[PDB]
Scaffold this active site. Sequence first.
Site, short mmCIF file in Angstrom:
data_model
loop_
_atom_site.label_atom_id
_atom_site.label_comp_id
_atom_site.label_asym_id
_atom_site.label_seq_id
_atom_site.Cartn_x
_atom_site.Cartn_y
_atom_site.Cartn_z
N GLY A 90 10.07 76.34 22.62
CA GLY A 90 8.65 76.53 22.90
C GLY A 90 8.31 76.06 24.31
CE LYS A 121 10.33 70.71 20.31
NZ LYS A 121 11.52 69.92 19.93
CG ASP A 125 20.73 67.23 22.12
OD1 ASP A 125 21.73 67.39 22.84
OD2 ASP A 125 19.70 67.98 22.14
C1 LIG Z 1 14.93 71.69 27.63
O1 LIG Z 1 14.72 70.33 28.00
C2 LIG Z 1 14.83 69.31 26.96
C3 LIG Z 1 13.74 69.46 25.93
N1 LIG Z 1 12.88 68.27 26.02
C4 LIG Z 1 11.65 68.61 25.71
C5 LIG Z 1 10.76 67.33 25.60
C6 LIG Z 1 10.04 66.75 26.63
N2 LIG Z 1 9.43 65.65 26.14
C7 LIG Z 1 8.65 64.68 26.85
C8 LIG Z 1 8.21 63.50 26.24
C9 LIG Z 1 7.58 62.58 27.01
N3 LIG Z 1 7.44 62.83 28.34
C10 LIG Z 1 7.89 63.99 28.86
N4 LIG Z 1 7.71 64.17 30.25
C11 LIG Z 1 8.04 65.32 31.06
C12 LIG Z 1 7.55 65.25 32.35
N5 LIG Z 1 7.79 66.23 33.26
C13 LIG Z 1 8.49 67.28 32.84
C14 LIG Z 1 9.03 67.40 31.51
C15 LIG Z 1 8.78 66.37 30.62
C16 LIG Z 1 9.73 68.68 31.59
C17 LIG Z 1 10.48 69.24 30.40
O2 LIG Z 1 10.51 68.64 29.35
C18 LIG Z 1 11.19 70.57 30.67
C19 LIG Z 1 12.57 70.76 30.04
C20 LIG Z 1 11.35 71.41 29.39
C21 LIG Z 1 9.56 69.21 32.87
N6 LIG Z 1 8.84 68.35 33.47
C22 LIG Z 1 8.49 68.59 34.91
N7 LIG Z 1 8.53 64.93 28.13
N8 LIG Z 1 9.74 65.47 24.79
C23 LIG Z 1 10.51 66.53 24.49
C24 LIG Z 1 11.00 66.67 23.06
C25 LIG Z 1 13.16 67.64 27.31
C26 LIG Z 1 14.63 68.02 27.57
O3 LIG Z 1 14.98 67.94 28.98
#
Ligand SMILES: CO[C@@H]1CN(Cc2cn(-c3ccnc(Nc4cnc5c(c4)c(C(=O)C4CC4)cn5C)n3)nc2C)C[C@@H]1O
Lengths: 263, 263
Positions: B20, B39, B126
């Site tokens: 998503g 998310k 993971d």
């Molecule tokens: C495919 O990527 C996988 C999936 N996963 C998703 C995820 C993020 N979550 C979270 C929780 C608390 N803070 C944050 N901060 C944050 C800040 N800037 C960000 C991102 C996240 C961000 C992404 O997430 C991009 C990769 C999609 C890009 N940018 C610039 N993310 N929690 C989840 C479960 C990350 C992991 O890399």
Amino acid sequence: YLDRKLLTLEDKELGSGNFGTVKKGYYQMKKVVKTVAVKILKPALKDELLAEANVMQQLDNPYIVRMIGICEAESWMLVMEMAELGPLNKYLQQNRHVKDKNIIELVHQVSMGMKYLEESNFVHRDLAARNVLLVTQHYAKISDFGLSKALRADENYYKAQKWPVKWYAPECINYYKFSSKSDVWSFGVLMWEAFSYGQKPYRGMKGSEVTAMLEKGERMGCPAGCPREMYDLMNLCWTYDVENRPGFAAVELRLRNYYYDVV
Amino acid sequence: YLDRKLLTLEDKELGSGNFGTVKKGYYQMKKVVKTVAVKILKPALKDELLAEANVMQQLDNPYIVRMIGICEAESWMLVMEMAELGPLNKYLQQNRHVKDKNIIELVHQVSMGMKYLEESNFVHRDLAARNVLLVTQHYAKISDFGLSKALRADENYYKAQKWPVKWYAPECINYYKFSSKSDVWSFGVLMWEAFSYGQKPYRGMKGSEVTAMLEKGERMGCPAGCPREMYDLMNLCWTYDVENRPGFAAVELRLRNYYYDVV
Ligand SMILES: CO[C@@H]1CN(Cc2cn(-c3ccnc(Nc4cnc5c(c4)c(C(=O)C4CC4)cn5C)n3)nc2C)C[C@@H]1O
Ligand SMILES: CO[C@@H]1CN(Cc2cn(-c3ccnc(Nc4cnc5c(c4)c(C(=O)C4CC4)cn5C)n3)nc2C)C[C@@H]1O
């Protein structure tokens, strides 16, 4: 309860599943011996076997597998009369030149057994071509009463609280309600399987994808060589609204009349 | 369950995947507003998000991302405290002059969160640098609990029935058994990624080629500028036999002692 000393099991299994195994055996009667198929287990599985035997003990029809009894020995065993040619789907996979009239004969026999089950107020809940066993190429019996329920005297369905969802009607999936009409839906899938010589239904599809297809109003296509009248009957079995779907008396009559036309 | 009217989403996504999207937002507390990362899902996916939230709700540690709650609205949403600097691998790719001592600090933080997860009898399944999120350049948190499992009270592994295979220990691949020791193997790969400033591990290799390399006894080389003591610890995490591999208490202590040596 049978006498283990009157039962002789063959060593090699006919088949295997998550329940345990199926073996051929012999049960010594008053003079003759009877060839039997024996479902051998291995808390909940034992209870399920006893319930399965309790359903079968109450059924008395030429198109339903007959139980001989249960035996509690080295493992728990359900002893049944042997249907020597085995499951219908596998037989048709191995015998691709069985004639269309023969397929009609067999599915009509299944519809006679189901008409009896309906009259007896039992729901099968797993009516699929793998659960039809052949005595001969011209004589089918319904097996596999492990999910079957005796309906309450005051209700026309069983309410449930791994399912064969490709065989289940929408009300089963959406309301957990299982009626003889739900078995009619499964019977339509069984028909499709039989006229497809044992192909799996909804090939390549996940359960959720099947639900989405059916909710769009879509249905499986007509198998190669299947008469239009039989595809029409499959589609009537797949009537979405349970109140407008036929019961097994109507289904059996349609099959009976078409079979004797082709004959 | 959160109140959708206390949630404000930003229009532009932070990121996207098959999972998503991730969006920034705000959740109105009693007085303060909290910046959140959300998310947002695009049958199985819903169940997986609810299980992910159920894991996170049981975890309480400074080095693990905190969940605020779930929200069922225009889509299903998992609302988390925002780690503003995003995934560790991307941050290090963009900040190639972060100092070695700073990398030790961050991987030690991850080993503290994992020591807690191990004590709590959860397996992450993971653990990779993309799943470590930075609050500041000196504060890492573990995220991404979508594959995580609560271990049964009577077992010290989860038995499984697409995987991040380059991060998985040999017992995961060969026996489908996931323990905290399996997470230690993944942590070695994470260390390699961090000391490599976010390079992908086993670059240019298929999964089967990785399995073949590891079965030969071969391991990735030491990243440029990585201390010998840290490469030694990576290689201890990549101990083939799970019974001889250290747990996170031993790994965290080694990292703690080395960090305060460099401090
Ligand atoms: C495919 O990527 C996988 C999936 N996963 C998703 C995820 C993020 N979550 C979270 C929780 C608390 N803070 C944050 N901060 C944050 C800040 N800037 C960000 C991102 C996240 C961000 C992404 O997430 C991009 C990769 C999609 C890009 N940018 C610039 N993310 N929690 C989840 C479960 C990350 C992991 O890399
Ligand atoms: C997983 O399969 C499901 C479960 N279920 C089990 C079952 C069989 N039962 C029975 C009763 C009377 N006769 C027979 N005859 C008979 C002859 N040859 C056979 C089989 C059965 C046979 C199997 O059963 C293989 C598929 C396991 C393989 N071969 C060559 N089977 N009764 C039950 C309750 C069948 C259905 O397909």
